[PDB]
Design a protein around this ligand. Structure first.
Ligand SMILES: CCOC(=O)n1ccc2ccc(C(=O)Nc3cc(C(=O)NC4CC4)ccc3C)cc21
Length: 338
């Protein structure tokens, strides 16, 4: 039986949700719609509810809506956000215009927990191990975040973490330089770069690359990692592209031990492996988990990978109505987790 729904205005938008979700409180806007904290009267737990913004307005919005719902329905890991529920106030495909997604709230994001504090080495080990374990899983399904930052990390009172907003792509401080140089031949280690920026900041209490704009962001990144070496310059196919980066003023690579003074030598070594300018030489999520830095947390028998994920829809050029219908079927066939 279809639950009883109720209307409420929040941030100049109507929210129509089942009666099971009580006390909606706005927590901000997060990936193509706003998010409310709510109390789930069925479980007694606190949930995050997202109302997608104009999900079937255009073709881009309709495909993005399908992409997100398909991703959420597949993702089943401790350090990756999962779907608790998906609903629409619509009674038919014809009336179907709104999509709401329900996940765990955890408590807060990584920014409100760290709040620019210099964290202890063991605390950093726990936080980074969790992000990496989550990324290993996401990456094994051929899914990348491409915009990982502290605000996409939902964290518990016990510092248990879940990654949010992966597979869909604000601050540019955690962005891989290859994305900003628009190399468009990049791999899964764009996420590893972001992990490196986060880890350095948790260790030092300061943003590693706090650029003021697009130009300044690259300038700051190249000051630490250096201008591209001979090996990386040979890999640039377009001469216009090779002429652009080799005009950003030469910079030698800094020794990280002379930058992160007093830090655990194993933390310095892992940062060297995470913040390599050449994406082909940058460490993977799986390799990073096996690094000596995580010796206390690493368990090769409890670092699972994802089941095969069918994302052939990505190559398809369909009409709004076809993406809408495909999304509707995914809503009605949703099985809540145990
Ligand atoms: C926006 C500000 O939010 C906060 O400050 N937050 C603090 C804790 C917290 C927990 C969850 C959320 C949140 O956005 N949840 C969510 C994620 C996805 C998601 O990750 N989707 C992509 C495809 C994988 C889809 C649906 C929801 C409900 C926000 C949260």
């Amino acid at each position: 039986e279809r639950p009883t729904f109720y209307r409420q205005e929040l941030n100049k938008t109507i929210w129509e949700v089942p009666e099971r979700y009580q006390n909606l409180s706005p927590v901000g806007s997060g990936a193509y719609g706003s998010v409310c904290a709510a109390f789930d009267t069925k479980t007694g737990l606190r949930v995050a509810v997202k109302k997608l913004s104009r999900p079937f307005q255009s073709i881009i919005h309709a495909k993005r809506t399908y992409r997100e719902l398909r991703l959420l329905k597949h993702m089943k890991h401790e350090n990756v956000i999962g779907l608790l529920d998906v609903f629409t106030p619509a009674r038919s495909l014809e009336e179907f215009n709104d999509v709401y997604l329900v996940t765990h709230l955890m408590g807060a994001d990584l920014n409100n927990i760290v709040k620019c504090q210099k964290l202890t080495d063991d605390h950093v080990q726990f936080l980074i191990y969790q992000i990496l374990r989550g990324l290993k899983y996401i990456h094994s399904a051929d899914i990348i975040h491409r915009d990982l930052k502290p605000s996409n990390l939902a964290v518990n009172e016990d510092c248990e973490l879940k990654i949010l907003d992966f597979g869909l792509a604000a601050t540019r401080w955690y962005r891989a330089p290859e994305i900003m140089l628009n190399w468009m031949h990049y791999n899964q280690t764009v996420d590893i770069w972001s992990v490196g920026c986060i880890m350095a900041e948790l260790l030092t209490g300061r943003t590693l690359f706090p650029g003021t704009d697009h130009i300044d962001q690259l300038k700051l990144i190249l000051r630490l990692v250096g201008t591209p070496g001979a090996e990386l310059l040979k890999k640039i196919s377009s001469e216009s592209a090779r002429n652009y980066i080799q005009s950003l003023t030469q910079m030698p690579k800094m020794n990280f031990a002379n930058v992160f003074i007093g830090a655990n030598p194993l933390a310095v070594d892992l940062l060297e492996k995470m913040l390599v300018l050449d994406s082909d030489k940058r460490i993977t999520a799986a390799q990073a988990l096996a690094h000596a830095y995580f010796a206390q947390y690493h368990d090769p028998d409890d670092e699972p990978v994802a089941d095969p994920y069918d994302q052939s829809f990505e190559s398809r050029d369909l009409l709004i109505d076809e993406w809408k219908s495909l999304t509707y079927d995914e809503v009605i066939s949703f099985v809540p987790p145990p």
